[PDB]
Amino acid sequence: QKRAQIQKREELLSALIDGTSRLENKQFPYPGSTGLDDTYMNSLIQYLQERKQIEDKWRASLLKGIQDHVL
Amino acid sequence: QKRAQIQKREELLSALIDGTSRLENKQFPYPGSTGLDDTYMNSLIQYLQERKQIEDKWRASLLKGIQDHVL
Amino acid sequence: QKRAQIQKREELLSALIDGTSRLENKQFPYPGSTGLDDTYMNSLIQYLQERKQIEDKWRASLLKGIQDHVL
After folding, report:
1. Of the candidates C17, C6, C22, which has an alpha carbon nearest to the alpha carbon of residue C71?
2. CATH code of A24's domain
3. In chain B, which residue ranges form alpha helices assigned H by DSSP?
4. How far is the C-alpha of A20 from the C-alpha of B47, rounded, in Å?
5. C-alpha span between B6 and B52 (Å, rounded)
6. Directed axis angle between helix C2-25 and helix C38-67, to 10°?
7. Cα–Cα distance between B54 and C38 in angstroms, integer?
8. Contact B45 A58 (CB under 8 A)
9. Which letter does DSSP use for residue C27 in this model?
10. Which of A16, B16, B19, C18 is the most exposed place for a label (fewest CB within 10 A)?
11. Burial level of B31, CB count in 10 A (0-12/13-18/19+)?
């Protein structure tokens, strides 16, 4: 049914919008006056680690949408 | 109209091709003989910061294409 | 033909599944008790360098799929 096929298309768009928005709204951490200190480097690493998770969910969501013929 | 629906499909493909090509053609900076010096680390950080921007535009373009039924 | 159009849709899905799975299954390297030592920083850099390659192939595969009307 579309009952399912709209559940799928809705799921997908909501997931992709959520993902896209959270990814793009995150500020990239660039060093300030303290340079490449331990605080800075942690912030960079934590940024990359979080971004991985959200990117990975985003691609997975897209692929599922492609597999399920939702787009 | 397709006047719009081709404007949309054309926009999209051009944007995605531009993005894809700029992302893939960028060389990943790996340390050389000077190791993890301040020059190297800046080059890595600037690479990541730029790549974020282009990746974020690319995903946004794709999502818009999905939302507008252009693909 | 679909002979080609299924070759294309099959190629694509297999490529995207391969890519997605390899990206998401890779553990993000976060520093341990030794901190930001040269071993750690190499592991981070090698992670990013590999991830670039696989991400870039994944996007290229997707775009080709969009261009060839396979999805």
Report:
1. C6
2. 6.10.250.2770
3. 2-25, 38-67
4. 20
5. 28
6. 160
7. 29
8. no
9. P
10. C18
11. middle
Task: Check if B48 contacts C (Cβ < 8 Å).
Answer: yes
CB distance B16–C52 less than 8 Å?
Answer: no
Neighboring chain B residues of C41 at a CB cutoff of 8 Å:
36
Resolution (A): 1.6
CA-wise closest residue to B62 among A5, C48, A17: A17
Which of A35, A70, A29 has its CA nearest to residue A49?
A29
The DSSP result for A6-63, as a single string, is HHHHHHHHHHHHHHHHHHHHSPP----TT-S-HHHHHHHHHHHHHHHHHHHHHHHHHH
- The label of the residue with tokens 């960079």 reads A44
Region of B28 please: left (phi>0), alpha (psi -120 to 50) or beta: beta
- For B56, the closest of A23, A36, A44 (CB atoms) is A23
Q: Provide the residue range defining the domain that includes C6.
A: 1-71
Half-sphere exposure of C18 (CA within 13 A, CB side): 12
Which residues in C lie closer than 8 A to residue A56 (C-beta atoms)?
20, 23-24
**What secondary structure letter does DSSP report for C34?**
T
